[PDB]
Every structure is written in structure tokens, then in C-alpha cells.
Subunit: 431 residues, 2 copies
């Protein structure tokens, strides 16, 4: 649908966009429709989508199977409350999630958004120790991590990124080990592994859980680390009895080349958070799974229950489109498509590493990252990308690609070629 000149001014003057200023917002672009792997602007220009609307749209846009599953569930009921009620979409979705996740995970808590799913996992960890009579209130994690924007999640986000300086006096105080990415190109710094274990052993009676994003640290820097980290952290947790929360809201459903990034290490978390691509990026839904032991334990405390329940919990429409999205993944095609994207990204982004504006090129699965030596000029780059017929949304010192799995070769070539051109243009960087 059409937008007037006055509509676009009203948006600028009244409508917040993610992490924007209301006094001096950068321009936005008017999208009318989306089809396959393309966004369609007012006036008809089509942009190849390089971002999958931030991870989630792994099957692209206007997918006929996802559309049909939504309209079918609307005909039955788009929503009914989940208190004292169950329904077929939630049951099928939770069957599918239990069946496809690492083996100890048996119990599913459906929720609205990724941030809430993390809050839920944190609350579960705290109720777990409360049922066991211990006062454990601290979470141990990596630097460079990202877990959401609500206050609980913010307290495990990296203490320089989320500007903790402003909320530190309000935000709960957690434990932050060295970032896992090696300091100079190696697989991992054993020193960083030893330093993680020292922090854990030093606070082992205060730590409720370790929380981390497995293999890829997303919004905190698109950083990629070795799976030895996960096998070793899993062993440490097992030795202490501490819970392991895996935040796969970004990595889940195939994007790093395995269905769940935990599979890279062959470990199972005690609590697993999912979101984003769960619905094929059609609408918001999240899920937090736990082991039987965790769920029974948090059923044993003085709570009598797990103390959480969103109004739209179990929403039939979102469950029904998540089911159709998961059914698309059951073809198994994603695993091959993602491997071929990975190989093309590695080959076509390599020339960028020669640029003086570029500090690193790194690829895993269908994630291609060009880390720059200076912050990007977002407005100038966005205009350039749109002029080239593509949609790429950089931030900070990162120009990165996470396209839909069904992207065609020439569409992906247009993305990598645009990125290579962008890093040669000094005007596209700030100071």
C-alpha cells in the first residue's frame, strides 16, 4: 500500500524506528510489498534483500506455503487464550521443537519475542536454585554478547555496547569473562578459556547459569568463535551443577550451517532460547525449552509454578506459520543451500580484505561479515546500496550479509559486488 508525501513526513516526525533519534532521524525507505528475495519500494524499484529482515526471513517473502498456512489458521481462529486451553498449532509446534532439538530438551515455554524468551530462561535459572535452597543470583557470560533490550536481558549484554554506564546503577551486576574470539586469528586463546574457568570457580556458589550465544555473537559484533569453547563450558557447568542457557534466537534454524549452532560442538544446553526464524520471519514468536530436570525443579519451589505467562502465549496464528516454516526446513534443502551461500560469500567477499577501510572478512554459513576500520556512514551507505538495487543495513564497523536461504546466484553476486564497491569509497565512512 501507497504512501503519500505527507505520510512519509508524518513517519519522520512521529514514528520511532529501531535505535533512532526523534530529533534527527536518518531517512527511511518506503516499502510497499515483498516477494521472493526482493523488497519492492514505492515507485516500483526492487531491492535484493541481503538481511532477511535481521535473520528471520530464511524462506524470503510472500512464501506461498507460509501464506496458505496463515490464512488457513485465520479461518479456524487467529487467537485464543492459553490459560486452561490448548490447541492443535501449539501442540504440533511443541512436538516439532522437542523432536528436532538436542535430546535432554523436553519442555517448551512459548512466548512473544526473543527478549522475553531470554527473560524467561533467566527466571527459570533463578527459580531452579530457589527450589534447591540456594541463593544464586549471578549469571556468567562472555564479553561482546547480546541478548535483548529488556532490563533482565540488558544485564547480560556486553557492558560497553549497551551503554551500561547509564543503567549500571539500575541493572543487576553479572560476571563478564574475556570475549571468546581469538585475539590475533587463532582458533581460540586457551588463556581466555582458563580465565573463564577461574571466574566461574571464584563465584561458583553465586552463579545460577552461564548464558551465551553459541558460535556467533550477533548484535555485539558479528563475532565467530571456535566450538571447543562450548564443549569446555559444558564440561565446566556439568562439574559444578551450573545450568547452561544457549541463546539461539539468531543462530537457530540453520543459519550457521547446522540446524542449531550447538550441534557444531555436539553439546546440549539445559535451557535453549529460540525466536526470529522460528516463524519464517512472518510475525513475532519465541520459545524457551528446558530439560525435564529443570522443569520439575522449578515446579518444586515455593512458587508452585513457573512465574510467567504472556497474554498472547501460544498464539495459534504464529504457531501455525512456525509449523509451516519448520515443515519447509524438513526438506533438508537449507543445509545444502546454506553451504553453497557460505562458499560464495567466502569467494566473493575475499577481495574486500585488501581494502584499507577493512579490518577482517569472516564467513560462517549464510553470514558474511566485513569488519571495517572506521564506523560506517549509515545514511550515505544506505543510499548507495539502494542505488545498486540491494538492501544491506550496516551498523558501527560492520557491513554484513545474511540473505534468505533461497537467494539466487546473481542476486547474491549483486550483494557481494555492492559490498566490495562500498568499502573502496571513503565517503561511505565517518570519523
Amino acid at each position: 500500500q501507497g504512501m503519500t508525501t505527507d505520510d512519509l513526513a508524518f513517519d519522520r516526525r512521529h514514528i520511532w524506528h529501531p535505535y533512532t533519534s526523534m530529533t534527527s532521524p536518518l531517512p527511511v525507505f518506503p516499502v510497499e510489498r515483498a516477494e521472493g528475495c526482493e523488497l519492492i519500494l514505492s515507485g516500483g524499484e526492487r531491492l535484493v534483500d541481503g538481511m532477511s529482515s535481521w535473520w528471520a526471513a530464511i524462506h524470503g517473502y510472500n512464501h506461498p506455503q507460509l501464506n496458505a498456512a496463515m490464512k488457513t489458521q485465520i479461518d479456524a481462529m487467529s487467537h485464543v487464550m492459553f490459560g486452561g486451553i490448548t490447541h492443535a498449532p501449539a501442540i504440533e509446534l511443541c512436538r516439532k521443537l522437542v523432536a528436532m532439538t538436542p535430546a535432554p530438551l523436553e519442555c517448551v515455554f512459548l512466548a512473544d519475542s526473543g527478549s522475553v524468551a531470554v527473560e524467561v530462561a533467566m527466571k527459570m535459572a533463578l527459580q531452579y536454585w530457589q527450589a534447591k535452597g540456594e541463593s544464586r543470583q549471578r549469571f556468567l557470560t562472555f564479553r561482546n554478547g547480546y541478548h535483548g533490550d529488556t532490563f533482565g536481558a540488558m544485564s547480560v549484554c556486553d557492558p560497553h555496547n549497551s551503554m551500561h554506564s547509564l543503567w549500571k546503577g539500575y541493572l543487576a551486576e553479572n560476571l563478564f569473562a574475556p570475549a571468546p574470539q581469538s585475539r590475533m586469528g587463532g582458533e581460540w586463546d586457551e588463556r581466555d578459556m582458563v580465565a573463564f574457568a577461574r571466574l566461574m570457580a571464584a563465584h561458583r556458589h553465586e552463579i545460577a547459569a552461564v548464558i551465551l550465544e553459541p558460535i556467533v555473537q550477533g548484535a555485539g559484533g558479528m563475532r565467530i568463535y571456535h566450538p571447543q569453547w562450548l564443549q569446555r563450558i559444558r564440561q565446566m557447568c556439568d562439574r559444578e551443577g551450573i545450568l547452561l542457557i544457549a541463546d539461539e534466537i539468531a543462530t537457530g534454524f540453520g543459519r550457521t550451517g547446522r540446524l542449531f549452532a550447538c550441534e557444531h560442538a555436539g553439546i546440549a544446553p539445559d535451557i535453549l532460547c529460540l525466536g526470529k526464524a522460528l516463524t519464517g520471519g512472518t510475525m513475532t514468536l519465541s520459545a524457551t525449552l528446558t530439560s525435564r530436570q529443570v522443569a520439575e525443579t522449578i515446579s518444586n519451589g515455593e512458587a508452585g509454578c513457573f512465574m510467567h505467562g504472556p497474554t498472547f502465549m501460544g498464539n495459534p496464528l504464529a504457531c501455525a506459520v512456525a509449523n509451516a516454516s519448520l515443515t519447509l526446513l524438513e526438506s533438508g534443502d537449507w543445509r545444502r543451500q546454506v553451504a553453497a551461500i557460505e562458499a560464495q560469500l567466502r569467494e566473493e567477499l575475499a577481495p574486500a580484505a585488501d581494502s584499507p577501510q577493512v579490518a577482517d572478512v569472516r564467513v560462517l554459513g549464510a553470514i558474511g561479515v566485513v569488519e571495517t576500520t572506521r564506523p560506517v556512514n549509515i545514511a550515505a551507505l544506505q543510499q548507495f546500496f539502494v542505488r545498486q538495487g540491494v538492501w544491506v543495513r550496516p551498523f558501527g564497523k560492520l557491513i554484513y550479509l545474511m540473505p534468505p536461504y533461497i537467494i539466487q546466484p546473481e542476486q547474491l553476486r549483486r550483494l557481494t559486488q555492492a559490498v566490495n564497491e562500498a568499502v573502496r569509497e571513503e565517503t561511505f565512512f565517518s570519523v
Copy 2:
């Protein structure tokens, strides 16, 4: 869609429902479809819905205008990212919200769920004072209130209800004035008003905002208080420069008899949170509106922006069905329908007040509350209600009704008659 015997056992064994135990959950009922004001169970029994799926389904179920608006937007695009992008559903929705809300409210932050909308409002208040160079980290509120389940919202929830005893060591410490409901039937206790003002004046340099649910306190007790509270709190805030956050996630869009419960007092908050009935209860969406002064101020600090941005922010599908829901309210019929429901609830619930199991009957708008002297036996009552052909979900000491605005007379009579019968049956109460 159909559920097998084995599906229902899998739900019991694997699927959390709101505030449930995984070890001893109460039974749930299998819903296949919903139409008009009725839920349809497996096997075909139809239940009159007394709850509107917890506030939100004000137009009932399977509404043809809401269905058509969803399918139309699916054909265009169900979702695209909002970072650097705008679209027609978000613009129309934000135009409608600005136009219909109290006059200073001009800027709209769209989000995923009610809890996140509250977190957003709290973050806005904190960034506001940070931009003004003051360290204000405390929130002042009423006892008996409810604002959501994430950690930030939990810290303004009533300190006995949400079991703060478990999170108090993790949860931020806020200020809690006497509950507003009068102690013995009057309109208000001036002493409680004086005590609120003393707490504010005693901490006036630490208080970032007052947050409250206007007129009706929902999950914290379905309590109803006089509008003099709002006019006086608004005056106090104005005198100190303190922000007023109105949480209308439950009261917004007509349920208390006015479009927004703030209109009962004729006051405007600095920040207004909306949710639930926003989409007609078809799927989750929230919105937090602010004044121009707040938005520019939180654009002035060291942040450079408002530090929040959900992945599905601005979701076109949810915006499009919220637009259709708001267009239904533009008929103005809701205001008359709600007044007639109020009058029927008052007349038909009055006999319940004679019961020894009952402590109070209170009605406002399309909300009818029977407060009991002992906690309900939820399992036994739920079975009774379903046997009577209705859906009523009590909790604690509350049996209450919040039906869709389009409920028919005989449907509402069946609800009130079931409630009257339930409070005469000692078996339906626990110890």
C-alpha cells in the same frame, strides 16, 4: 484442527501454560475454532466466552473485517524489518493512535508485547533524566498494581503478589504507596492520597516517574478506584517535573466505558502504554506513546537515540489488523455496547453479593468482578463453567467477566447466571 488422545497427553507432559506447574498441571480444554462470541471445543460443544482471551478480543472471534484485513496484508507482505524502512500499515496505525489519544501524546514506539511496552516506558523515563543530568532511578507506584512479567516490569508489580521475596535480591527497589481502593467502601481515602504525596516529596529527587494502571488495577486484584486519584497525581507530577506513565495495556480501547481510562479523570500522561485489544486480540502488538518533550529529551542525552528496537518492530501484519480493529471502534458503537453490558452486569451480579462465599461485587464498563472470601478451586470451577456452556477463568479470590463488546443478551445472562450458581457451591472453593 483435531487433537488426538496422544496430542492431549503430550501437551500435559511437555507444554507450559501460563503460570502452571509442569509436575502437576491442572487440566486444559481442547479448542478447535472460535466464532463470534463462542469457543468451539473438540467434539463440538460451544462455550460463551466470558474473558475475551484476557481483555483483548473486544470484537470476539473470527471477525470478518479483521480476517479480511489480515489476508490482504499477507498478500502484500506479512513482515519486513523497520530499520531504515517504513510502510503503510505502521503509518496508518501511528496516525490513528496519535489522533485518538490525549493531546500532548505525539510520538509512537511500536513494540511486540505489553511487558516490553512497559520496559520501553521505564527506559524512556530513565533516559529522560539522564539527558537532564540527574540520576533518577526510582519509580513510584501503588500497591496492588500489575505491569508484566519481565524483570523491569516485575519491579513495579505489587511486592506481595509477584512473590518479590524471590527476586527482591535481584530486582530493583522502587517506591510503593498505599493501594488506591478505599479501605471500607468510600470513593477514596484522602489519607492514602496524603501518604502518596508524602512518599513523593520525600524522594522527589530520586523519582523518575510515577507508573500506574488508571482506574482499574487488573491482574493485581481487579480493583477499581476513583478518578480523583489521577487528577491529583497528575497535579503532583506537574509540580515536581516528574513524568506520569499510564499503563493502559488492559484498560485501553473502551473497556472501562471510555476509550482510555485516563479520560475518566480528564488527564494526559507523559507516556502511555497500549497492547491487548490494540489488535482486536488476534495477535500480539504493543505501543508506547510519549510527548514531544519526552522524545526530544531522550534524543538529547549521551545515547544519541532511544536505546530499544525489537526485531519484529512495526510488523506490517499486526499493524494492519490493529488498523481494522480501530476502524471498527470508529463506529462509536463500543461506547453504547459497553454501557449496556455494565448495566446488565450490575443488575445480574447483584444477587451474588448475598452469598457467604462472596466479599464484594463491583462493575465498571464491561468488567464484572465477584471477589470471594476464600480462594477458588480452579479445576472444579473450570469443569463447572464448561459444563454450563461458558468460558470463565477465575484466579485467587476473583471470579470475573470481561466479555466481548458484541456479546448478545442471552449469552451474557448465561455468564452471570453461571457465576451466581458457582458462588453458592462450597465445593468450588479451596482452603
